Paper text:
Here, we explore an alternative to the perfect Gaussian distribution for serial crystallography data using data recorded at the LCLS (Linac Coherent Light Source, Stanford University, California) from microcrystals of the Blastochloris viridis (B. viridis) photosynthetic reaction center (RCvir) as a representative example. The phenomenon is illustrated by re-analyzing data collected from microcrystals of the Blastochloris viridis photosynthetic reaction center and comparing these intensity observations with conventional synchrotron data. Here it is observed that serial femtosecond crystallography (SFX) Bragg reflections do not follow a unimodal Gaussian distribution and it is recommended that an idealized assumption of single Gaussian peak profiles be relaxed to incorporate apparent asymmetries when processing SFX data. The results show that skewness in the SFX observations captures the essence of the Wilson plot and an empirical treatment is suggested that can help to separate the diffraction Bragg intensity from the background.
Finally, we make a preliminary proposal for how the properties of an ex-Gaussian distribution may be exploited to infer the Bragg intensities of an ‘idealized crystal’ in the microcrystal slurry. While the typical intensity observation is strongly influenced by diffuse scattering, the highest ones are more likely to originate from good crystals. Thus, we can aim to determine the diffraction intensity of an ‘idealized’ crystal in its ideal diffraction condition. The highest-intensity observation of any given unique reflection may or may not originate from this group of ideal crystals at the top of their rocking curve, but we can define a region of the intensity probability distribution where we expect the ideal crystal reflections to appear even in the absence of an actual observation. As a first step, we have developed a Bayesian model to infer the probability distribution of the parameters of the empirical ex-Gaussian distribution from the intensity observations of each Bragg reflection using a minimally informative prior knowledge (assuming a uniform distribution). For each Bragg reflection we determined the maximum a posteriori values of model parameters (μexg, σexg, τexg) as a starting point and calculated 50 000 Monte Carlo samples [Metropolis stepping], the first 40 000 of which we discarded. Subsequent modeling steps and map calculations were performed in the Phenix suite using identical protocols (see §2). After molecular replacement by Phaser the final log-likelihood gain was higher when using the Ideal Crystal data.
Residue numbers in the entry:
A (entry chain D): 1 to 45, 61 to 258
B (entry chain C): 1 to 323
C (entry chain A): 1 to 332
D (entry chain B): 1 to 273
Write the structure that this text describes.
Amino acid sequence: MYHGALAQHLDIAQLVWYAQWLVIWTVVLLYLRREDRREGYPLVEELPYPKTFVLPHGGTVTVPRRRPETRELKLAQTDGFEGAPLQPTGNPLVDAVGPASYAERAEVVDATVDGKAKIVPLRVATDFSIAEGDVDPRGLPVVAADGVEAGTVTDLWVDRSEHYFRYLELSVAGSARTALIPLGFCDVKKDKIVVTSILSEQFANVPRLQSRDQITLREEDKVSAYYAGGLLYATPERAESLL
Amino acid sequence: ADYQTIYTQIQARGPHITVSGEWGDNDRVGKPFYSYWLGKIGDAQIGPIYLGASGIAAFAFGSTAILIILFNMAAEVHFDPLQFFRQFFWLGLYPPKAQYGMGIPPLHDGGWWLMAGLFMTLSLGSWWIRVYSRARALGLGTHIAWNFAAAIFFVLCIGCIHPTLVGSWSEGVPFGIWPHIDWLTAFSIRYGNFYYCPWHGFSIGFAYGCGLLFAAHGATILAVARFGGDREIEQITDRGTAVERAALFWRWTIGFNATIESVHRWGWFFSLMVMVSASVGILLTGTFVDNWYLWCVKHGAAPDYPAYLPATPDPASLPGAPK
Amino acid sequence: CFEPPPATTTQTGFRGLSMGEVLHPATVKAKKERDAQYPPALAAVKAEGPPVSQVYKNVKVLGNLTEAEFLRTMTAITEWVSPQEGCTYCHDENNLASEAKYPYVVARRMLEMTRAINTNWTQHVAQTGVTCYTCHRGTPLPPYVRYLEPTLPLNNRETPTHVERVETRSGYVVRLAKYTAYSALNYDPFTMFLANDKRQVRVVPQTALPLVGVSRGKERRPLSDAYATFALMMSISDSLGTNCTFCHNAQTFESWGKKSTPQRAIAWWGIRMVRDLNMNYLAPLNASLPASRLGRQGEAPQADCRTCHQGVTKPLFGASRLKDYPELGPIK
Amino acid sequence: ALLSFERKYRVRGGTLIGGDLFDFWVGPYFVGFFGVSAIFFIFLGVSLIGYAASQGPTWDPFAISINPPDLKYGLGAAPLLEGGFWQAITVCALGAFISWMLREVEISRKLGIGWHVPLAFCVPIFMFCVLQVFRPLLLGSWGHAFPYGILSHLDWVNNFGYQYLNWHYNPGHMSSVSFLFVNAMALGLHGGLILSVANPGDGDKVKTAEHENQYFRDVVGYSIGALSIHRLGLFLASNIFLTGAFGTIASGPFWTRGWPEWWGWWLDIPFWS
Ligand code: BCL
Ligand code: BCL
Ligand code: BCL
Ligand SMILES: C/C=C1/c2cc3[nH]c4c(c3C)C(=O)[C@H](C(=O)OC)c4c3nc(cc4[nH]c(cc(n2)[C@@H]1C)c(C(C)=O)c4C)[C@@H](C)[C@@H]3CCC(=O)OC/C=C(\C)CCC[C@H](C)CCC[C@H](C)CCCC(C)C
Ligand SMILES: CC(C)=CCC/C(C)=C/CC/C(C)=C/CC/C(C)=C/CC/C(C)=C/CC/C(C)=C/CC/C(C)=C/CC1=C(C)C(=O)c2ccccc2C1=O
Ligand code: HEC
Ligand code: HEC
Ligand code: HEC
Ligand SMILES: CC(C)=CCC/C(C)=C/C=C\C(C)=C\C=C\C(C)=C\C=C/C=C(C)/C=C/C=C(\C)CC/C=C(\C)CCCC(C)C
Ligand SMILES: [Fe+2]
């Protein structure tokens, strides 16, 4: 006699093997794969029933979003093939196509847990400062990809929820304006801030904020996307082959 | 290159935040201090820490188990401080070597082991209350607590459940660096090579799977840190171009993608399945399977290979061979 | 900490199973030189004459040899056992028929034990065989013996440290460790497995499902037996200077046939031979050996794998004196 | 065919070689020069496995095995059915791995993101080379590599570990194992945290990034940070093979005994021996 033996040449560990495969594929295909479809669906050119979040500072959202307005794309198709790439019809940095594209985030200010504006410059966040030993970039020149001084740093924007600097603000030389740049696009040296994503003249068309001492979620998207589009569009050579 | 993905070029300092919980705000202890070099690859603030009854009970129960283990280890070198520091990796507390069944074994042959395991079980249960109650106190889901409970469950499987199902405290895991390592080989030998346990392979695939997922996910968020991809809670409720490019990277590579929320459900599911698979494999082991290799041979799954050196008969089977 | 390349690697299983030996040439070289000290065979002698059962006074084993053939063996034994003490290690210089010295009465039992190995244990020693030298290596005390408790160093010609001494209780774990290839297995596989025939080295079932009546509670062997078998296998692997794949396909340790090498079967006869030597020849010698040879439990020194092999899969890399001394076996 | 937010990203550019020639999509997949070469090596590799498997004794998926040559063939060519098929499939595997990685670089450049994913993909490709090329080269034969089979390659890992008595005492193994455990643990912690904030239960408000750091400062007294846990998780996962590559390449070329004995550098220091 044997423990675990059943009818036929069957045993208990054999049965659990089928049960284990059934549970795994049930979770994968019938749950995880449907949670993967809460954004970007339905396709254009199987879905789960909507999910609704109660936001921390009032109001709700239900995903995926249905925006009351949609943007017009300044793109031209290269061919009639269904999988052909598109082509910009103007300046892709200001038209925001390709790597310069931003999402239609809410035009609301991202908030701290206690309701204040999360991303603010140090002129507003007077209780914040740069840690001892690190470079204070205020007053340092910003050198763009062509080696020309694009401007001078005037302030740093800090995330008051995570204690983490995320942007530098610089006066654009010869443009009577200030533009924000994500610190990921900044190589902070002791005497200069190096920026290779765009050229010096392209700092003039960085998307501008509606208010001087705050920023919205969509404005943060617009500012970040402009420098990223320069990785492919700052010069004609960046869109071509590396070799 | 995004230098922020390597380290924090400019660290920020500010007043330390305290989010109120439903209870226990007064039980947070410690003056926070800030490490410059820790701040380069993480948050610079260390402390404070919450105490609470369950966290205190965890230290008391756990220190009791550790004290029982270390004392028994010091006796194995006859309380020689040099040899203890020398032989430390080799010292251990062992389960009963003789077969007493489920009877509580003597102190010199498994009694101290069973008592340290009891206090360790109480320490783990106390810490799970803390992990569970801290989430409820802050209005958070218990996603970490239930992942934690699966790891505690697997520890119970190799610690007392399987010993009870087969009916012997001798099958339990010893305490010690090398001694608990040696148990892995004796447990695999006894039960016919764990490479032929399907739940071993399931647990291995999920353990490898967590390595693939955190390498791909961690690198993906670093790749979209230029667009604030690390701000994931608000990327869930308000999709930004960070997780749009992230989904399109994987959609253009493997033909499908997840969301910034659901990729966590994949990661939470894979880590959970490492323990769920390992537990079911231990629970079937010995109780309903005695030899996993022959169990595969019974079902025809085992691979066979040609003879390289000539086949060797079992000499114990030969006529006239000694016993 | 590390050993330089290149390494000597053999193949013991089907390609792609990663079975075979992994050796270091510098180690093998030093063992080959050490084992080359085997004194060559003495020259042949006159085959005609009376048997020493007639000529001599107290010959009990070698009585059929002639005088010239008998004094030849008396020279080889001295070369193999006591070359520095000479004839008088075992003989009263003034009467060679007297048993007044303890090595005399032990050597006769050893002459019987040597013929027994070469005659009754050919399933193991084959035509290579053993002489006195295979263990003694030129000294009356063989370098690699075991007592009823772990001892260090393994080679008794080396001076022990304080912690290595069996009296120092704080070094027991290291004495256990070095006899099991530095593992932390808490079992002495000599007294458990090689001193006698009491225990069963095999611990893995030969059934896919747990057989009823031997699978629950006190019907079960403790899992300690699996550690102990593992301990014997690390000691076997170290004493031969080899690894598992010299004998097992690690796919299924418990299976024979294509899953085992021919050496594993020879090893099986080697375990039965060690127990025969310890139980019936070496252990009873504690009544004939002086108290300075005995262990702390009154035991005479006993033999394991390393007594003959000394770190090589074959003793002396297969060197043999069988055809040169037929009086040592096989015995018709 | 396209995601609801996909069309504005479907531009040309970002290629390494080829230009517009292969810069197109096939369904959701992007192609590029390296998507062509990837399909080339996969087709060539899957073909070789099929033809070699037909020559074998079984079509059972668990029983099929394509093995390397005998040790005696060394690093030279081997008969097609005696190890040659293994040699060609290995070349195709590396070609498909490296093409897959460079394809990921092109997709990264078109999307304007960092190259973090293809760089991380170099880690498992590197470990594959340690097992199938580097360690065989140091040992002198390709037959030291593992076979291509669902259940047969486990027997390779098993025998290889026992060839050194107790592979658990391999110090490079202990490090590779420790990272495997801590990475799977950290993924359950981190994946559970994000889901706990976005799904507080009942009809409660979604919590904040402040709630993230407060939970782990309460439990363990420290919270590494939202971005930093992604740098950490990639560091923990990569060091499973980065540290494990040491112990694998040392077993044989640099150490021929059992791995427990290696620890004698500590145990056998004369002043406490
Ligand atoms: C040194 C350590 C060993 C090793 C030790 C082990 C052990 C031990 C185990 C495995 C297990 C597995 N290993 Mg292995 N494995 C190694 C290297 C490899 C390589 C390789 C390119 O070198 C491959 C393809 C695999 C593949 C696999 C799978 C068959 C299986 C589950 C892994 C998993 O979930 O991963 C994470 C990845 C995912 C979750 C994503 C999905 C991946 C799918 C499942 C891959 C299928 C590959 C399949 C064989 C088809 C190959 C291509 C064909 C030509 C179509 N291993 C090395 C050589 N591997 C386990 C098992 O069950 O094996 C049967 C197991 O027990
Ligand atoms: C010779 C040795 C055997 C072997 C023997 C075993 C045995 C036996 C087991 C495994 C198991 C596992 N093996 Mg193994 N395994 C081998 C070869 C492999 C190989 C390989 C490539 O060859 C791989 C990848 C693996 C991988 C795996 C794991 C995925 C799996 C689950 C365990 C785990 O993750 O524990 C890591 C996680 C934990 C231990 C959980 C800990 C959780 C608790 C809460 C932590 C508490 C901390 C607290 C501070 C402690 C305080 C203590 C104080 C005293 C108070 N094995 C070979 C074949 N393996 C298990 C399994 O799946 O069996 C079916 C198992 O039981
Ligand atoms: C008796 C046997 C030994 C043993 C023998 C070995 C050996 C031998 C080795 C390991 C190694 C490893 N062991 Mg083990 N190991 C044992 C016990 C354990 C235990 C345990 C709890 O006891 C654990 C957790 C582990 C765990 C581990 C891993 C962490 C480690 C690295 C695996 C590896 O290289 O994968 C390799 C995986 C790959 C190369 C995958 C590459 C994937 C590529 C890039 C992509 C493939 C795509 C695929 C073909 C696509 C198919 C298409 C589909 C559409 C998907 N071992 C026992 C004690 N272990 C290794 C190590 O580093 O040791 C130091 C090693 O060499
Ligand atoms: C330490 C870091 C790690 C890590 C990380 C990452 N992992 C990544 C990425 C990152 C970052 C990606 O970006 C990339 C990807 O997009 O993911 C979705 C990828 C991927 N990880 C895969 C498998 C995987 N990762 C493993 C290991 C780790 N990953 C560890 C944990 C293991 C283990 C453990 O076995 C497996 C099985 C594929 C799913 C995928 C590549 C597909 C490919 O390259 O397609 C191109 C190739 C093919 C489609 C097949 C080619 C077939 C050849 C010609 C013929 C067969 C040869 C073969 C040797 C036969 C084997 C038999 C078998 C029984 C032995
Ligand atoms: C037809 C033809 C020849 C076309 C030619 C063009 C061409 C090159 C086609 C490719 C054809 C091939 C080879 C297809 C095979 C592709 C492969 C290897 C598929 C394997 C799928 C597997 C098993 C992946 C394992 C990992 C896994 C379980 C993932 C599930 C969860 C997902 C999708 C994680 C990926 C993912 C991560 C990691 C994020 O961080 C993230 C962040 C924000 C949003 C989304 C995501 C996201 O989707
Ligand atoms: C290590 C053991 C050993 C050594 C060395 C040794 N003897 Fe012997 N000797 C014995 C034993 C035992 C016997 C009895 C054997 C027997 O009964 O057949 C014996 C018997 C003899 C006898 C028979 C005498 C008699 O009448 O019984 C002679 C002669 C002899 N040995 C000479 C020698 C010579 C010559 C040497 C060295 C050159 C030597 N011995 C050294 C152990 C030894
Ligand atoms: C030179 C011979 C030899 C070497 C080296 C060797 N083995 Fe053994 N092993 C045997 C033999 C013979 C048996 C069978 C014992 C018996 O029949 O009493 C055995 C038995 C076993 C068993 C138990 C078989 C059963 O049915 O329970 C295991 C497990 C094992 N060996 C593993 C190992 C390990 C682990 C190593 C090294 C680390 C090793 N072997 C090295 C010869 C060897
Ligand atoms: C008293 C003598 C003696 C002892 C004790 C001894 N060996 Fe042997 N062994 C030999 C001799 C002599 C040979 C040479 C046989 C040959 O040449 O094939 C040998 C050969 C072997 C072989 C064959 C190696 C090969 O390459 O063919 C193995 C395996 C082996 N021994 C294992 C063991 C094991 C296992 C033990 C104990 C458990 C042991 N040895 C102890 C005398 C001994
Ligand atoms: C100094 C600091 C900061 C920390 C010190 C840590 C330290 C030095 C510890 C000392 C030695 C070490 C490192 C020991 C390591 C031990 C290891 C790795 C143990 C690993 C596994 C052990 C396990 C899983 C044991 C499990 C045992 C159980 C689950 C027992 C369960 C018991 C029961 C259910 C009791 C109910 C039965 C009742 C009738 C009595
Ligand atoms: Fe995340």
